[model samples]
Target chain A: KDLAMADLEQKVLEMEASTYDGVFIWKISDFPRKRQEAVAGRIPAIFSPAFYTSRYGYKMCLRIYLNGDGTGRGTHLSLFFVVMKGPNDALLRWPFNQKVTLMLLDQNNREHVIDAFRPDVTSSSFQRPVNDMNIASGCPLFCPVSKMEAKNSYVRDDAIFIKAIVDLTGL
Target chain B: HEEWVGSAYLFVESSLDKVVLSDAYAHPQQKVAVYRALQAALAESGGSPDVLQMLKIHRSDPQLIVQLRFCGRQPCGRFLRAYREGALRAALQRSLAAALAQHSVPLQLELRAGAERLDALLADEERCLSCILAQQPDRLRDEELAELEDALRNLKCG
Candidate 1:
């Protein structure tokens, strides 16, 4: 995962998070429609949400690719996170061991489906992207559209709210 | 005068408490839940001019204080897929489109800084209190104006 460390710091600094919520709301309304076979990065996730490890340290963000690809073809949703090492990374925790919780917010005010996982300490994926600017990691089969659409719990008003929480205090 | 189209979700305060009908108690998340309810109400009405979707999305202090309105229809799909599928900007798009298909015409057409808008919002509430007081000493005092002042005390963004 050779990421560009330079841009990682830049993009991370661009976003501001509230210590109150510490959660980034990733909004996706106009995901490109596909025909048969799916493609990667076909539609770049726009204005995606990112969070800071500290006030000015490691910056984290999530990017989504619709039309499902790889193992998530034709049905599943793909979500990935890029860990950008910030100028203040030296003061932050290395090999970031935080709990990432993802939610499918229902607009109709129904039940929200949630999934979360711990960062792998040994895997190259979990280590700080010191060498690279960005480390692209995510879940291919995060969830099914049909299940989320069921009872319109997660999907309301033709929109759904995706919430990502980085357990800042989990350490 | 209008039909078919829907009201853009008002990203008001983001922590607008939810309630049963008017002045009731609903959780902050319940507020967004109400928005989805409005979307269903509007869509089911099938372009009825009567159904206008409005949700007082609550927020904790130090919140994004602004009301962004835009064009939209059947956001449930996006709302559903936005979070799971990633590309959250989509959910934040119309309810974030002008953000895409939802918003087209900019009603106010000017973006004010948070402080400016926040100042005005609180000031409006103060002005309302004064206006009510100046009007009459004792007219519909208990039932109507009393209710107004109490509600005014808890302004949406104030």
Candidate 2:
């Protein structure tokens, strides 16, 4: 059973890797009103991203509901991240430096880059930026985005919520 | 009552011709069914006959053993209920004996209902029943009944 389960996991990873550009992350957060809306059938929010890796870091694409109300009662929001890395962190060069890019892929396959908030450096010396964490989080972050593509498109107003970050420093 | 005795006599008669006993019992379902039938026969005869006494008589009787062995590979729910009513302790022992004989393996019948032994037996019975039901008769022939009967007739209770 264990071997079978592992084989299943490997198959899923292979499938996801072949289809998407980078790794993906899925974040599901529900507001009170959004939860009620989901129950009431008023809003649809299923947000996820698909990601891939490059020579520098990872790239992500978000898929979310584009036509639904973004600020309605009981509106659900989701965020997907895709971080790309080489096999066995081979892409991390030396002192573990990192950079990440968040992209929104439209219906036409055009890419829109989105930025993540930087960490407050004054309060903490280890100002690990969202971009750096995004890269380090690996495959689990990127897979969820592609999973949500059937439910929503990659549009900001229609986006229940979508963002991406790249992580470095290998810390 | 007379009806109980009649049923017992009917069981012994009808069951004898169809019964098959063997020393090489291989199916758990058959064994369980035989044990149950024996229990039912005794319960129908109902007076002071306990499980141990009933099993002893059945073991001594070749025909009875043969009949039980034949029915052993089938579901024994009805038979078991009858046996349970007459003598729970003795029925338990007979159940174990039949199971062991069916497998052509040695086993201990000193299992108590409260202990894990009973649970194990029930589980084994369930598993065998499922296995038997899942396959067609053509896939697995019911050939061990005769061997089971012979073994049960000569079985000793400790």
Point to the candidate with the largest DockQ: 1
- Stretches of candidate 2 above 4 Å error? A9-52, A55-76, A80-87, A90-171, B1-158
Instruction: Note the DockQ of each predicted structure.
Output: 0.01, 0.00
Model 2 residue B28 lDDT score: 58
CAPRI classification of candidate 2: incorrect
Deviation from native of the Cα of residue B99 in model 1, angstroms: 51
Collision count for each candidate, in order: 44, 46
Write one digit per residue (lDDT tens) for candidate 1, span B23-118. Answer: 211344333333443333333432232322221222212222111221232342232223233233233323322211233212211112211222
Instruction: Report, to 2 decimal places, the DockQ of model 1.
Output: 0.01
lDDT of each: 0.41, 0.33
Best by TM-score: 1
